[PDB]
Design a binder for this molecule. Structure first.
Ligand SMILES: [Cu+]
Ligand SMILES: [Cu+]
Ligand SMILES: [Cu+]
Lengths: 69, 69, 69
């Protein structure tokens, strides 16, 4: 169970950020996630054996935002 | 039939504000509502016998914004 | 096949702009469109015989943004 601060560009709407939190949440592995709209940050916590950042990032880019690598 | 200027924080998108206007609109009581994205204001008008601010606020917070009390 | 820079006000969310690109895209005539969120611009390219700016604008205003005439 790790905790990471993904750097995210492009998030600007409090309503739409709700969907970020929701899709990264529906990922097995994901024990929690909280989107910090103003820091462009998606601090996440999870089971590193059950999901990867790659998916998580992938689930973040499918909303259309940019995950810094 | 009253007219109130709800103070709202978090609204930033012209497209998403459309949904605010729409859900507070579908509330029985609600004779009209207009969202002022730049003043963070949801001036509403309604039948005070047929719906409360509480719901209205509630319908605004379900979009994810913050109704000042 | 023309290429136009529609001036657009109101676009602010990278996620929601995705829907702009998508609906103007589903228009017969439309060979491409790219939304420039920061310039408030919707540079489009199309077959002038198969769709008009009017629709395109119309498809942009249905998202709730303002097409400068
Ligand atoms: Cu939004
Ligand atoms: Cu939006
Ligand atoms: Cu959005």
């Amino acid at each position: 169970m790790e905790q990471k601060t993904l750097q995210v560009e492009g998030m600007s709407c409090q309503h739409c950020v709700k969907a970020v939190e929701t899709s990264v949440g529906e990922l097995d592995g994901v024990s929690a996630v909280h989107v910090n709209l103003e820091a462009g940050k998606v601090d996440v916590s999870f089971d590193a054996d059950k999901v990867s950042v790659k998916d998580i990032a992938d689930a973040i880019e499918d909303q259309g935002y940019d995950v810094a690598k």
